[PDB]
C-alpha cells in the first residue's frame, strides 16, 4: 500500500524501488505477496442466508393462507362439538402445502446460485503487467497482482486494481466510473498530481480504479493497492444499492393473481350467503350463530383450495431451474429477466468479428507493387503459412519460400505492421502457446513480422519467451515512436509519428505509418510505393488495387483487409493540434500505399446450424459489422444468412448507403436487410432503435466495446466470454464458453417457462372450477351437503400441491421450437382457453356431486335406493312427505362424502395427466416424460389412502370407502376426463384456422 495518491510520478516509483521500463523483480514479487497478501475480494456473500431465502411467505396468495391459518386455529380455540382433533388438523393443512412449496423454491434457488458461483472459477481474470523475468509486456493471474507492479491498460481491460497513472500512450485516456463514482459518463485522465489526501475520487483525475472499465485510450501505470484496500473493496460489503425487480412475465401473472384472489372473494361471499335458509337448521342445534359460524368456514375452506397458492412457488422454481441450466450451458445469466425476454424474442442482432468468427486472426496473403508503367500495374503478391499466432513460418511467392528481406516493399510492410500496432505477443509456458497481449486484427501483424524477419535476426538461439517479439523489438529500435494517432472509427484508421533512432544512423526525416480499413485509406493516397522510389497515384493503379482486395474479400477464404501506408512529409510535430478527435483524418493525408495485408479468420462451426435454428423457430438474424462489405456479405453466404446463389442486392447496405437513406426507408430496410457493413457504434445502436419501433423483441450479441451502446439499448444483450469487459458491463447474459449454440437453448428455455406456466394455469383453474361447481351445484339443487370444511382442506393439499408444482418441470412441449415466436402483446389466457377451463371443470364438478348421488339411488351396497327423491332435509327430521317407510337418518351418512371427494381427487390427478401440453394428446407425450408428475400423483393418492385405511384417521376425516364397487365407480367417472381434454387437445390441433 501507498497511503496517498498526491504524490508525483517519480516519489510512487522510488517508494516501492521499481522502475518504470524493467517493473517489479521476481524477488520483489514473491516478498509483497507474503506482506500485501493477493489481490482478491471475499465473495461477499453466498446469498443464502438460510432465512432471508426461506422467507419467500411474501407474495399475496401466500399469506392469505396464512390469515386462514390463523382463524382456524382460533375457532379451534373454541371447541364445538368434540372438533378439536378436527379444528386443530384445519391450520396445519394450510400450513402443510405451504411448507411442501417453500422447501422446494428454496432448494431450487440454492442450487441455481451454486451452479452461478462455480462458473465464476471458469476463466479467471487476468492482467498485463511489466516484470524483470521477461522483456516484453506479461499476462499473469490478477489475483497475483501486488502494490509496485507496472500494469498496463487499455480499451475494454477491466482495471485490476488501484493505479498510479505514470503515462498515458494515446491522446487521450476515458474511463468508465458509473459504477464507482455514478458519474454515467466517460471522465478524462491525465498524470499530473493533485495536492489534497482527502480529494474526493471524482476529484482524484490521474488513477484508476480496480472494477471500473477503460472506454477509450491505452495508458501505463503503477499499483497503488489491491485486495480489499481497493477503493472499490472499501464498498464490496458496506454499501451498495441492490437491484432487484420482478420479470415482464412475473408481474404479469401478479396482475393475474390479485384480480383473481378478488374474484374468489366475492364466490366465498356468494358461498356464505346463499346458504343464510341453512344457519337455522338443526346439524348445528339451529343457533343462528352457531350455524353461521360454520358457513363461515366453509368459506375460508372454498377459498384457500380455489387460491392457487403455488403459483410464487412455481415461478421462482421455473426461474432457478432456467438460470440452473444456462449456468450448466456455460452461460451466466447476470439479468433474471434475460432467460425469459430471450424466448419471445424475433430479430437477433449479430457481430461479426470475434462474435460470429473465431477472431483467430493470422495473415495469410500480402502484396505490393511491382510494376508501374502507364495503365499496366503489376503486384509481387507473396503467400504466408501459419496459422495461430506463433512466430512459426515461411513466406512464399510463386509457390516457393523468398527471404522478405529481398523486396524493399517488404521492409517497409513489416516497419509499418511493427510500429503501427498497440499490441504484442506473450507466451504462456503452462499451455505451451503463444497468446495474443491486445486486438487481435494487431496481434496478427505482430505474429506476420516475426515470420517475414525481414533484417535477417538471429533468432535461431532464441528461447520460446524472448522468440515472440524478436524481430519486432529490431524495428522498434531504429525509429523512435514519438506520439500515437489512436484508433478513432470515423475514418477507420490508425496512425503513428516516428523519428529516426539516433539522428546520425538514419536522417531520413520524420514518417507517418498509418493502416486502416483499405477503401478510407486508399482514398486518402496520392503516390504507390514501387520498390524504393515513389510514383504518383492514376486511375488505373487505384482499381487495380481495390480489385484484388475485392477478391480476397470475396473468394473461399473470406479474408479480411488492412491497407498499409506511410506518409513521407509529415508535418512539422508542433503544427499538430492532439486535441481534436476529428482533425486526425486530415493529418492522415497525402499518403503513399505500401501494401495490403489478407488476414483469415475463420467462422465458428455452432454458427451455421444455429441460425437454422432460428429461421425454424421464427428468428431472423442480422450481420452487424464495421468489416468491408465484400467480406460482410461473403461470410453470410458461408454462415447461411444467404443463399450460395442468391441475389442480395436490397438486403445488404453501407454505413453511409444507410445514411443516405431518408427516415422512411432506413427503418424499411432494418425490416427486410440481414446484412450492415461499413457502420459505426452509433450505427448500430439505430438498427437496433429500429427494430424496436416495430414492437419487435430484439437481441444483440457482441464482444467488443464495438458494439456497447446497441448491447444496452437491446432488449437482451448478449455478449462473449473473450470479449472486452466494456460489452460484458452492458450484457443481460454472457457466454463464457463462446459458444454460439447456447442462444438457441437460452431461447428454447425461455419458450418452455412459459408453456409451462400456461398449463400451471390451466390445471388448478379448470380444476379448482369443479371445486366451486361443486360447492354451488349441491346447494341449488337442493342436495345436502357433500363436503366439510377439513374435507376441502384436504382436497387443497393433494391436488393443489406437489402435483401442482411438479408442473414446472415439464419437458419442452414438442413443437415449441418450429411455431413462430410469442408476441409480448398476447393475452396470458385467450378466448379460447377460458371456454376449455371450464368445459374441464364443468364435468369436474358434475362428476363429484354425482358420484355422491350414485351412492344414494343406485349403490344396492349397504344403505339402497332413493330412485326420484327430493331429498328434503327434514323427511328424516320429521315425516312430511306421508312415507310409510321414512329411512332415518340415511342422510349425512358417512360413505358419499366419502365417495365425492374420491372422485374429486382423482379427477384432478387424471387432469393433470393431461397438463403435459397445451394441445398434444398422450398418444405423442405420454404420462412418463414427466417422472417428478407421477410422483407426486402417487404422493397425492397414497397419502389419501392413509385417511381411509389406516384406523384413527377415518374418524378425523369420515369413514372408510368400501372395496371393489366403490372405487371402480370413482375410477370410471374419473377417467373420462382425460378422454374429454384429449378430444378438446384433438379438436384446437386441426382447427387453429381463423
Ligand atoms: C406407496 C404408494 C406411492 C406413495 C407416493 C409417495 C411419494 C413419496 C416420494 C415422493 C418423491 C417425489 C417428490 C416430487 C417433489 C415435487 C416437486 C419436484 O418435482 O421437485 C423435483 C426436483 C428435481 O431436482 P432437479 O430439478 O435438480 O433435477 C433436474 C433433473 N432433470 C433436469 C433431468 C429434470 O427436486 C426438488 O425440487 C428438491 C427435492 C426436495 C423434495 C421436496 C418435496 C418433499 C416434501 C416434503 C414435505 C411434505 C410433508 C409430508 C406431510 C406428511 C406428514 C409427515
Ligand atoms: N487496431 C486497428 N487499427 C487500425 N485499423 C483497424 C483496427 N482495427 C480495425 N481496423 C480497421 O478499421 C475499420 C474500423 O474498425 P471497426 O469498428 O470496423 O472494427 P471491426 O468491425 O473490424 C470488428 P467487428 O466486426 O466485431 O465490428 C475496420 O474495418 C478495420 O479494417
Ligand atoms: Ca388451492
Ligand atoms: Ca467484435
Ligand atoms: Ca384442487
Ligand atoms: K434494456
Same mark, same amino acid.
Given at each position: 500500500?501507498?497511503?496517498?495518491?498526491?504524490?508525483?510520478?517519480?516519489?510512487?516509483?522510488?517508494?516501492?524501488?521499481?522502475? *518504470?521500463?524493467?517493473?517489479?523483480?521476481?524477488?520483489?514479487?514473491?516478498?509483497?505477496? *507474503?506482506?500485501?497478501?493477493?489481490?482478491?475480494?471475499?465473495?461477499?456473500?453466498?446469498? !443464502?442466508?438460510?432465512?432471508?431465502?426461506?422467507?419467500?411467505?411474501?407474495?399475496?396468495?401466500?399469506?392469505?393462507?396464512?390469515?386462514?391459518?390463523?382463524? !382456524?386455529?382460533?375457532?379451534?380455540?373454541?371447541?364445538?362439538?368434540?372438533?378439536?382433533? %378436527?379444528?386443530?388438523?384445519?391450520?396445519?393443512?394450510?400450513?402443510?402445502?405451504?411448507? &411442501?412449496?417453500?422447501?422446494?423454491?428454496?432448494?431450487?434457488?440454492?442450487?441455481?446460485?451454486? &451452479?452461478?458461483?462455480?462458473?465464476?472459477?471458469?476463466?479467471?481474470?487476468?492482467? #498485463?503487467?511489466?516484470?524483470?523475468?521477461?522483456?516484453?509486456?506479461?499476462?499473469?493471474?490478477?489475483?497475483?497482482?501486488?502494490?509496485?507492479?507496472?500494469?498496463?491498460?487499455?480499451?475494454?481491460?477491466?482495471?485490476?486494481?488501484?493505479?498510479?497513472?505514470?503515462?498515458?500512450?494515446?491522446?487521450?485516456?476515458?474511463?468508465?466510473?458509473?459504477?464507482?463514482?455514478?458519474?454515467?459518463?466517460?471522465?478524462?485522465?491525465?498524470?499530473?498530481?493533485?495536492?489534497?489526501?482527502?480529494?474526493?475520487?471524482?476529484?482524484?483525475?490521474?488513477?484508476?480504479?480496480?472494477?471500473?472499465?477503460?472506454?477509450?485510450?491505452?495508458?501505463?501505470?503503477?499499483?497503488?493497492?489491491?485486495?480489499?484496500?481497493? *477503493?472499490?473493496?472499501?464498498?464490496?460489503?458496506?454499501?451498495?444499492?441492490?437491484?432487484?425487480?420482478?420479470? =415482464?412475465?412475473?408481474?404479469?401473472?401478479?396482475?393475474?393473481?390479485?384480480?383473481?384472489?378478488?374474484?374468489?372473494?366475492?364466490?366465498?361471499?356468494?358461498?356464505?350467503?346463499?346458504?343464510?335458509?341453512?344457519?337455522?337448521?338443526?346439524?348445528?342445534?339451529?343457533?343462528?350463530?352457531?350455524? @353461521?359460524?360454520?358457513?363461515?368456514?366453509?368459506?375460508?375452506?372454498?377459498?384457500?383450495?380455489?387460491?392457487?397458492?403455488?403459483?410464487?412457488?412455481?415461478?421462482?422454481?421455473?426461474?432457478?431451474?432456467?438460470?440452473?441450466?444456462? @449456468?450448466?450451458?456455460? &452461460?451466466?445469466?447476470?439479468?433474471?429477466?434475460?432467460?425469459?425476454?430471450?424466448?419471445?424474442?424475433?430479430?437477433?442482432?449479430?457481430?461479426?468479428?470475434?462474435?460470429?468468427?473465431?477472431?483467430?486472426?493470422?495473415?495469410?496473403?500480402?502484396?505490393?507493387?511491382?510494376?508501374?508503367?502507364?495503365?499496366?500495374?503489376?503486384?509481387?503478391?507473396? !503467400?504466408?503459412?501459419?496459422?495461430?499466432?506463433?512466430?512459426?513460418? *515461411?513466406?512464399?511467392?510463386?509457390? #516457393?519460400?523468398?527471404?522478405?528481406?529481398?523486396?524493399?516493399?517488404?521492409?517497409?510492410?513489416?516497419?509499418?505492421?511493427?510500429?503501427?500496432?498497440?499490441?504484442?505477443?506473450?507466451?504462456?509456458?503452462?499451455?505451451?502457446?503463444?497468446?495474443?497481449?491486445?486486438?487481435? %486484427?494487431?496481434?496478427?501483424?505482430?505474429?506476420?513480422?516475426?515470420?517475414?524477419?525481414?533484417?535477417?535476426?538471429?533468432?535461431?538461439?532464441?528461447?520460446?519467451?524472448?522468440?515472440?517479439?524478436?524481430?519486432?523489438?529490431?524495428?522498434?529500435?531504429?525509429?523512435?515512436?514519438?506520439?500515437?494517432?489512436?484508433?478513432?472509427?470515423?475514418?477507420?484508421?490508425?496512425?503513428?509519428?516516428?523519428?529516426?533512432?539516433?539522428?546520425?544512423?538514419?536522417?531520413?526525416?520524420?514518417?507517418?505509418?498509418?493502416?486502416?480499413?483499405?477503401?478510407?485509406?486508399?482514398?486518402?493516397?496520392?503516390?504507390?510505393?514501387?520498390?524504393? %522510389?515513389?510514383?504518383?497515384?492514376? $486511375?488505373?493503379?487505384?482499381?487495380?488495387?481495390?480489385?484484388?482486395?475485392?477478391?480476397?474479400?470475396?473468394?473461399?477464404?473470406?479474408?479480411?483487409?488492412?491497407?498499409?501506408?506511410?506518409?513521407?512529409?509529415?508535418? #512539422?510535430?508542433?503544427?499538430?493540434?492532439?486535441?481534436?478527435?476529428?482533425?486526425?483524418?486530415?493529418?492522415?493525408?497525402?499518403?503513399?500505399?505500401?501494401?495490403?495485408?489478407?488476414?483469415?479468420?475463420?467462422?465458428?462451426?455452432?454458427?451455421? $446450424?444455429?441460425?437454422?435454428?432460428?429461421?425454424?423457430?421464427?428468428?431472423?438474424?442480422?450481420?452487424?459489422?464495421?468489416?468491408?462489405?465484400?467480406?460482410?456479405?461473403?461470410?453470410?453466404?458461408?454462415? $447461411?444468412?444467404?443463399?450460395?446463389?442468391?441475389?442480395?442486392?436490397?438486403?445488404?447496405?453501407?454505413?453511409?448507403?444507410?445514411?443516405?437513406?431518408?427516415?422512411?426507408?432506413?427503418?424499411?430496410?432494418?425490416?427486410? &436487410?440481414?446484412?450492415?457493413?461499413?457502420?459505426?457504434?452509433?450505427?448500430?445502436?439505430?438498427?437496433?432503435?429500429?427494430?424496436?419501433?416495430?414492437?419487435?423483441? %430484439?437481441?444483440?450479441?457482441?464482444?467488443?466495446?464495438?458494439?456497447?451502446?446497441?448491447?444496452?439499448?437491446?432488449?437482451?444483450?448478449?455478449?462473449?466470454?473473450?470479449?472486452? @469487459?466494456?460489452?460484458?458491463?452492458?450484457?443481460?447474459?454472457?457466454?463464457?464458453?463462446?459458444?454460439?449454440?447456447?442462444?438457441?437453448?437460452?431461447?428454447?428455455?425461455?419458450? @418452455?417457462?412459459?408453456?409451462?406456466?400456461?398449463?400451471?394455469?390451466?390445471?388448478?383453474?379448470?380444476?379448482?372450477?369443479?371445486?366451486?361447481?361443486?360447492?354451488?351445484?349441491?346447494?341449488?339443487?337442493?342436495?345436502?351437503?357433500?363436503?366439510?370444511?377439513?374435507?376441502?382442506?384436504?382436497?387443497?393439499?393433494?391436488?393443489?400441491?406437489?402435483?401442482?408444482?411438479?408442473?414446472?418441470?415439464?419437458?419442452?412441449?414438442?413443437?415449441?421450437?418450429?411455431?413462430?415466436?410469442?408476441?409480448?402483446?398476447?393475452?396470458?389466457?385467450?378466448?379460447?382457453?377460458?371456454?376449455?377451463?371450464?368445459?374441464?371443470?364443468?364435468?369436474?364438478?358434475?362428476?363429484?356431486?354425482?358420484?355422491?348421488?350414485?351412492?344414494?339411488?343406485?349403490?344396492?351396497?349397504? =344403505?339402497?335406493?332413493?330412485?326420484?327423491?327430493?331429498?328434503?332435509?327434514?323427511?328424516?327430521?320429521?315425516?312430511?312427505?306421508?312415507?310409510?317407510?321414512?329411512?332415518?337418518?340415511?342422510?349425512?351418512?358417512?360413505?358419499?362424502?366419502?365417495?365425492?371427494?374420491?372422485?374429486?381427487?382423482?379427477?384432478?390427478?387424471?387432469?393433470?395427466?393431461?397438463?403435459?401440453?397445451?394441445?398434444?394428446?398422450?398418444?405423442?407425450?405420454?404420462?412418463?416424460?414427466?417422472?417428478?408428475?407421477?410422483?407426486?400423483?402417487?404422493?397425492?393418492?397414497?397419502?389419501?389412502?392413509?385417511?381411509?385405511?389406516?384406523?384413527?384417521?377415518?374418524?378425523?376425516?369420515?369413514?372408510?370407502?368400501?372395496?371393489?364397487?366403490?372405487?371402480?365407480?370413482?375410477?370410471?367417472? !374419473?377417467?373420462?376426463?382425460?378422454?374429454?381434454?384429449?378430444?378438446?387437445?384433438?379438436?384446437?390441433?386441426?382447427?387453429?384456422?381463423?
Amino acid at each position: 500500500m501507498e497511503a496517498a495518491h498526491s504524490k508525483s510520478t517519480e516519489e510512487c516509483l522510488a517508494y516501492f524501488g521499481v522502475s *518504470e521500463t524493467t517493473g517489479l523483480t521476481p524477488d520483489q514479487v514473491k516478498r509483497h505477496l *507474503e506482506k500485501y497478501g493477493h489481490n482478491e475480494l471475499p465473495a461477499e456473500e453466498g446469498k !443464502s442466508l438460510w432465512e432471508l431465502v426461506i422467507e419467500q411467505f411474501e407474495d399475496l396468495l401466500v399469506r392469505i393462507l396464512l390469515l386462514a391459518a390463523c382463524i !382456524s386455529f382460533v375457532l379451534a380455540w373454541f371447541e364445538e362439538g368434540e372438533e378439536t382433533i %378436527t379444528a386443530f388438523v384445519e391450520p396445519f393443512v394450510i400450513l402443510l402445502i405451504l411448507i &411442501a412449496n417453500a422447501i422446494v423454491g428454496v432448494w431450487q434457488e440454492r442450487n441455481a446460485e451454486n &451452479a452461478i458461483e462455480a462458473l465464476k472459477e471458469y476463466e479467471p481474470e487476468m492482467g #498485463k503487467v511489466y516484470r524483470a523475468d521477461r522483456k516484453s509486456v506479461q499476462r499473469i493471474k490478477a489475483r497475483d497482482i501486488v502494490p509496485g507492479d507496472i500494469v498496463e491498460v487499455a480499451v475494454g481491460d477491466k482495471v485490476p486494481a488501484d493505479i498510479r497513472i505514470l503515462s498515458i500512450k494515446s491522446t487521450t485516456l476515458r474511463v468508465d466510473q458509473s459504477i464507482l463514482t455514478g458519474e454515467s459518463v466517460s471522465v478524462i485522465k491525465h498524470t499530473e498530481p493533485v495536492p489534497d489526501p482527502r480529494a474526493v475520487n471524482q476529484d482524484k483525475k490521474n488513477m484508476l480504479f480496480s472494477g471500473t472499465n477503460i472506454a477509450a485510450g491505452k495508458a501505463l501505470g503503477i499499483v497503488a493497492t489491491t485486495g480489499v484496500s481497493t *477503493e472499490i473493496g472499501k464498498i464490496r460489503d458496506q454499501m451498495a444499492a441492490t437491484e432487484q425487480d420482478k420479470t =415482464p412475465l412475473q408481474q404479469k401473472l401478479d396482475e393475474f393473481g390479485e384480480q383473481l384472489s378478488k374474484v374468489i372473494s366475492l364466490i366465498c361471499v356468494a358461498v356464505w350467503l346463499i346458504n343464510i335458509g341453512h344457519f337455522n337448521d338443526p346439524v348445528h342445534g339451529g343457533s343462528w350463530i352457531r350455524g @353461521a359460524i360454520y358457513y363461515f368456514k366453509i368459506a375460508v375452506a372454498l377459498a384457500v383450495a380455489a387460491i392457487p397458492e403455488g403459483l410464487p412457488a412455481v415461478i421462482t422454481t421455473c426461474l432457478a431451474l432456467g438460470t440452473r441450466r444456462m @449456468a450448466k450451458k456455460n &452461460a451466466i445469466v447476470r439479468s433474471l429477466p434475460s432467460v425469459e425476454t430471450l424466448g419471445c424474442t424475433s430479430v437477433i442482432c449479430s457481430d461479426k468479428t470475434g462474435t460470429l468468427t473465431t477472431n483467430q486472426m493470422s495473415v495469410c496473403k500480402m502484396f505490393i507493387i511491382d510494376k508501374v508503367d502507364g495503365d499496366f500495374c503489376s503486384l509481387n503478391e507473396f !503467400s504466408i503459412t501459419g496459422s495461430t499466432y506463433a512466430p512459426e513460418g *515461411e513466406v512464399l511467392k510463386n509457390d #516457393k519460400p523468398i527471404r522478405s528481406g529481398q523486396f524493399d516493399g517488404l521492409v517497409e510492410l513489416a516497419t509499418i505492421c511493427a510500429l503501427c500496432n498497440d499490441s504484442s505477443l506473450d507466451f504462456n509456458e503452462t499451455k505451451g502457446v503463444y497468446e495474443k497481449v491486445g486486438e487481435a %486484427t494487431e496481434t496478427a501483424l505482430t505474429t506476420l513480422v516475426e515470420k517475414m524477419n525481414v533484417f535477417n535476426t538471429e533468432v535461431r538461439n532464441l528461447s520460446k519467451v524472448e522468440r515472440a517479439n524478436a524481430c519486432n523489438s529490431v524495428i522498434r529500435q531504429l525509429m523512435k515512436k514519438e506520439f500515437t494517432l489512436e484508433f478513432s472509427r470515423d475514418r477507420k484508421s490508425m496512425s503513428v509519428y516516428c523519428s529516426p533512432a539516433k539522428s546520425s544512423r538514419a536522417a531520413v526525416g520524420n514518417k507517418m505509418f498509418v493502416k486502416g480499413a483499405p477503401e478510407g485509406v486508399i482514398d486518402r493516397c496520392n503516390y504507390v510505393r514501387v520498390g524504393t %522510389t515513389r510514383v504518383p497515384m492514376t $486511375g488505373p493503379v487505384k482499381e487495380k488495387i481495390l480489385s484484388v482486395i475485392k477478391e480476397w474479400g470475396t473468394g473461399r477464404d473470406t479474408l479480411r483487409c488492412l491497407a498499409l501506408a506511410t506518409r513521407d512529409t509529415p508535418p #512539422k510535430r508542433e503544427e499538430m493540434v492532439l486535441d481534436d478527435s476529428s482533425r486526425f483524418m486530415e493529418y492522415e493525408t497525402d499518403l503513399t500505399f505500401v501494401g495490403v495485408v489478407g488476414m483469415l479468420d475463420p467462422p465458428r462451426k455452432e454458427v451455421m $446450424g444455429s441460425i437454422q435454428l432460428c429461421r425454424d423457430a421464427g428468428i431472423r438474424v442480422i450481420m452487424i459489422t464495421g468489416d468491408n462489405k465484400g467480406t460482410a456479405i461473403a461470410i453470410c453466404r458461408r454462415i $447461411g444468412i444467404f443463399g450460395e446463389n442468391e441475389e442480395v442486392a436490397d438486403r445488404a447496405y453501407t454505413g453511409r448507403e444507410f445514411d443516405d437513406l431518408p427516415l422512411a426507408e432506413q427503418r424499411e430496410a432494418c425490416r427486410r &436487410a440481414c446484412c450492415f457493413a461499413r457502420v459505426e457504434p452509433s450505427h448500430k445502436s439505430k438498427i437496433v432503435e429500429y427494430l424496436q419501433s416495430y414492437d419487435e423483441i %430484439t437481441a444483440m450479441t457482441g464482444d467488443g466495446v464495438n458494439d456497447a451502446p446497441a448491447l444496452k439499448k437491446a432488449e437482451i444483450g448478449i455478449a462473449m466470454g473473450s470479449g472486452t @469487459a466494456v460489452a460484458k458491463t452492458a450484457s443481460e447474459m454472457v457466454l463464457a464458453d463462446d459458444n454460439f449454440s447456447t442462444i438457441v437453448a437460452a431461447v428454447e428455455e425461455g419458450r @418452455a417457462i412459459y408453456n409451462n406456466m400456461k398449463q400451471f394455469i390451466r390445471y388448478l383453474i379448470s380444476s379448482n372450477v369443479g371445486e366451486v361447481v361443486c360447492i354451488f351445484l349441491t346447494a341449488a339443487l337442493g342436495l345436502p351437503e357433500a363436503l366439510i370444511p377439513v374435507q376441502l382442506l384436504w382436497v387443497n393439499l393433494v391436488t393443489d400441491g406437489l402435483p401442482a408444482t411438479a408442473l414446472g418441470f415439464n419437458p419442452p412441449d414438442l413443437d415449441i421450437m418450429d411455431r413462430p415466436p410469442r408476441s409480448p402483446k398476447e393475452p396470458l389466457i385467450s378466448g379460447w382457453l377460458f371456454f376449455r377451463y371450464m368445459a374441464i371443470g364443468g364435468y369436474v364438478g358434475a362428476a363429484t356431486v354425482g358420484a355422491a348421488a350414485w351412492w344414494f339411488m343406485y349403490a344396492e351396497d349397504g =344403505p339402497g335406493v332413493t330412485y326420484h327423491q327430493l331429498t328434503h332435509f327434514m323427511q328424516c327430521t320429521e315425516d312430511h312427505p306421508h312415507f310409510e317407510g321414512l329411512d332415518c337418518e340415511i342422510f349425512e351418512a358417512p360413505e358419499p362424502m366419502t365417495m365425492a371427494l374420491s372422485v374429486l381427487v382423482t379427477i384432478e390427478m387424471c387432469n393433470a395427466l393431461n397438463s403435459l401440453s397445451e394441445n398434444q394428446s398422450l398418444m405423442r407425450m405420454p404420462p412418463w416424460v414427466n417422472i417428478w408428475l407421477l410422483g407426486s400423483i402417487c404422493l397425492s393418492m397414497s397419502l389419501h389412502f392413509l385417511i381411509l385405511y389406516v384406523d384413527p384417521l377415518p374418524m378425523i376425516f369420515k369413514l372408510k370407502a368400501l372395496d371393489l364397487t366403490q372405487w371402480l365407480m370413482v375410477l370410471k367417472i !374419473s377417467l373420462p376426463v382425460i378422454g374429454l381434454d384429449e378430444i378438446l387437445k384433438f379438436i384446437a390441433r386441426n382447427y387453429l384456422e381463423g
